[PDB]
């Protein structure tokens, strides 16, 4: 029931006290829908890099990898679930900035331009919401201390400022990056999931949280395992469609059809 | 068919060449859903403004419509097709920012703060989605010169200058100022339909345009006034919504459930 008589109230403010806090509400209605036993095989891959920008956003991401694990100390002793939240917490947290500076500069484009966007800037929104839900699962397992809020606040203010200027610079290395960044991201939660299968990893955190339950459609007995395994297949989608589109963006396609609109 | 092998693959820039360019793919799937003769009672309203910030955005937006009308001419000599579409071009443009400033925002809130959004982001998203497809739809029906497609560059440099240094500050004005805008775009429109119903505007672009015709299910036979009709209640949709996020926050309620979520 939405029309001209509630089109035509100043505000709804008073109606705020009665509306419940779903959590299906949290994301939009364009939610991934992966079958467990399909996205099991997700795998591994590697672009080979074209040339002097390619080359630059594979070297940037995996020095960025090589400090990351190191300064937070991933690599030495056992994997834990507790080091495994606390590094995807922080992650998810740049994770979701790429696909909303992309969307938006398209959109702004779109306008100034008068052009179509023939459906991408959808993909990059979606994108970000995505991401930005693997941040909001992953923070009903682990509360951050002080010290971690403080640096994902710092780490934003770079990491918006360094993917912006790239975006409007070049396109092509900042879906380049994220491609690169994706191909990561596919290797740490095949990790996660190879150490527990191989009881390295001992999960705890078996009541998957309601926010995700219903994001990706998970039945009350999936479990951490499956959790990883759909976040790594939002992760593998990510990876192939920032991949083609800077691909396009090398082409001279940026302003042709999103591929993935009809793949659809 | 979208699974583990497609997730595999590393690029689908193959297929760019065979996807089809269609009209539903410009925007997301959530489309409004207006009923014709229902829509055709919206009307114009006021919200008194509360206080210094409201009353500092209505008076600009009025400054704004004062400034806009007179150096564009739009008060003398007869309204025309030429300079309605002309208007809503230029002005749709400016349209899309705010909204897309105000989810970007939420957005980057939500994964610094690693906070709950509850279900504002996509609303706002939506709407600049929804103006953005405005201004797709007045450019089928007339295209700009060179000295209208300059100032459209220019005016967004400065709007969305504006509009995001006023977000980060004040939130409340932008959602109070669009709320002011649309009250304004509402009465433009419905002047507009008034003309047509009144005969002073024999409106010649009948032929919706394909993009407009799949975005708000409008008939083929459908007219310019009809097209007219289901714009302006996209405005006063945003008119309620917008006055209504300014009053959350006014009364510090802007990390509560989005009203509208549910009121759906
Ligand atoms: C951008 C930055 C400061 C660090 C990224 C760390 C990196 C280059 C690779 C590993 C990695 C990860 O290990 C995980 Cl868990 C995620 C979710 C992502 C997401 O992009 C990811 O890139
Ligand atoms: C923001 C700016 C440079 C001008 C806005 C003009 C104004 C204050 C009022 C009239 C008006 C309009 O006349 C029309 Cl047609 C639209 C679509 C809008 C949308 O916001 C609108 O505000
Ligand atoms: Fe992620
Ligand atoms: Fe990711
Ligand atoms: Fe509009
Ligand atoms: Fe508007
Ligand atoms: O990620
Ligand atoms: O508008």
């Not at 979701?96 to 484009?109: E, I, K, T, Y």
């Not at 971690?148 to 092509?172: D, G, H, K």
């Not at 990561?184 to 999931?193: D, F, K, R």
């Not at 390295?200 to 009541?207: A, G, I, Y």
């Given at each position: ?185 596919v290797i740490t939660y095949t990790g996660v999931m190879r150490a527990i299968d191989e009881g390295r990893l001992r ?62």
């Amino acid at each position: 029931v939405w029309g001209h008589t509630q089109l035509n109230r100043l505000s709804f403010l008073e109606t705020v006290p009665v509306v419940p806090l779903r959590v299906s509400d949290e994301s939009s209605e364009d939610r991934p829908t992966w079958s467990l036993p399909d996205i099991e095989n997700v795998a591994i891959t590697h672009k080979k890099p074209n040339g002097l920008v390619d080359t630059l956003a594979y070297r940037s991401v995996r020095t960025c990898r090589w400090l990351f694990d190191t300064f937070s100390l991933y690599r030495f002793g056992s994997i834990t679930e507790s080091k495994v939240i606390s590094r995807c917490l922080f992650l998810e947290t740049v994770a979701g900035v790429p696909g909303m500076v992309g969307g938006m500069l398209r959109h702004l484009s779109s306008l100034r331009y008068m052009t179509r966007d023939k459906g991408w800037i959808n993909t990059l929104l979606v994108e970000a919401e995505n991401e930005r839900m693997h941040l909001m699962t992953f923070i009903e397992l682990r509360q951050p201390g002080l010290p971690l809020r403080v640096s994902i606040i710092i780490t934003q203010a770079i990491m918006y400022l360094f993917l912006l200027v790239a975006y409007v610079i070049s396109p092509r290395f900042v879906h380049r990056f994220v491609g690169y960044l994706e191909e990561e991201a596919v290797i740490t939660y095949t990790g996660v999931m190879r150490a527990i299968d191989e009881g390295r990893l001992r999960p705890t955190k078996n009541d998957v949280p309601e926010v995700a339950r219903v994001y990706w459609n998970l039945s009350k007995n999936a479990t951490f395992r499956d959790l990883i395994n759909v976040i790594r297949a939002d992760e593998a989608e990510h990876r192939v469609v920032n991949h083609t589109f800077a691909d396009m963006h090398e082409k001279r396609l940026q302003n042709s059809v999103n591929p993935f609109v009809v793949l659809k």
